[PDB]
Amino acid sequence: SDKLKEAETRAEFAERSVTKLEKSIDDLEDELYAQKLKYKAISEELDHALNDMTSI
């Protein structure tokens, strides 16, 4: 009985940890996507600048 209780508690702890880790990794992926979006926006602005500089 003692061993079973220990195992059950371990399982609950690990499950909660996996839930937190999944949420955190999803949030960090969202943040990376946002920063990539900003980089792409300024890169397209610079590409337009280069297109005009082709006439420069």
Partner: protein, 48 residues
């Protein structure tokens, strides 16, 4: 000719980083696919 070669390499790295950004966008897309598939399979597991 300095300006010419420089603008040439400028457009060149433009194209290169652009391909890299396309690859990274496809990476983000398959990433969101992975998020959705993990979400649905996790939800199925939790349902059971």
């Amino acid at each position: 000719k300095d300006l010419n070669e420089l603008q040439a390499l400028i457009e060149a790295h433009f194209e290169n980083r652009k391909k890299e950004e396309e690859e990274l966008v496809s990476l983000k897309d398959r990433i969101e696919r992975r998020r959705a598939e993990r979400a649905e399979q996790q939800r199925i597991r939790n349902e059971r």
